Amino acid sequence: MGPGFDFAQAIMKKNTVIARTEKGEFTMLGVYDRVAVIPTHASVGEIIYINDVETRVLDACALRDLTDTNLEITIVKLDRNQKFRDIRHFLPRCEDDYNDAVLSVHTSKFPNMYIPVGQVTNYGFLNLGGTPTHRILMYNFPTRAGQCGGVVTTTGKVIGIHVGGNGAQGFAAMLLHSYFTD
């Protein structure tokens, strides 16, 4: 409808795949080469389905901060025959608050879904499903089951991936440029 949705659509149309694990179907963001991200609660194993095709996992790393606290991001390298568009220059360098964000989801259950979530707070600490978690972004939208892995954007920036909700608020894990230096 406007320039926020335009940026979100440009990322969904070239930089997402549908990922299936034994724990469900997830929006998965491809960042560069064969490297993608997914919430750590997806429990990625040695094999994953990517757009309903059996795919070997070459590497999977569940990120933690230097205090050994969960960040809820897993970085996956896929044995795929095609590279993602390199979007690392759209990643923020530091922790921050944002205005006027969009949460975008693409699964079997929710195809071509875009949600204007408004103001995003640098929330920091969250007890997420009983697990202490850091670098959490919060937005005042009642997100639901099926939105995990959803991409959070502003105009010109890819800032996080949806990882949870409490019925009134939604929560995303930060994406930082420093996670994807090669």
Query: Is there a single domain that holds both residue 23 and residue 51?
Result: yes
Helix, strand or coil, per DSSP, at residue 60? strand
Largest interatomic CA distance in the chain: 42
Query: Is there a single domain that holds both residue 178 and residue 90?
Result: yes
Residue 143 belongs to domain spanning: 1-15+85-182
Query: Is there a single domain that holds both residue 34 and residue 100?
Result: no
Catalytic-role residue among 41, 106, 134, 162: 41
Query: Is there a single domain that holds both residue 149 and residue 164?
Result: yes
Catalytic-role residue among 106, 134, 148, 162: 148
Query: Is there a single domain that holds both residue 94 and residue 152?
Result: yes
Distance CA 100, CA 79 (A): 36
Query: Is there a single domain that holds both residue 40 and residue 89?
Result: no
Last residue of a domain, one of 27, 50, 84: 84
Distance CA 140, CA 106 (A): 21
Query: Is there a single domain that holds both residue 129 and residue 54?
Result: no
Per the listing, tokens 């959490």 go with 136
Query: Is there a single domain that holds both residue 2 and residue 22?
Result: no
Instruction: Give the bridge partners for 158, in sequence order.
Output: 153
Query: Is there a single domain that holds both residue 76 and residue 145?
Result: no
The structure was resolved to a resolution in Å of 1.4
Give the chain's domain count: 2
Last residue of a domain, one of 69, 84, 99: 84
Closest CA to 91 of 8, 5, 174: 174
89 is catalytic: no
Burial of 139 (0-12, 13-18, 19+ CB in 10 A): buried
Last residue of a domain, one of 68, 84, 100: 84
Experimentally, how was this structure solved? X-ray
Query: Given phi > 0 = left and psi -120 to 50 = alpha, else beta, which region is 43?
Result: left
Query: Is there a single domain that holds both residue 165 and residue 89?
Result: yes
Catalytic-role residue among 72, 106, 134, 162: 72
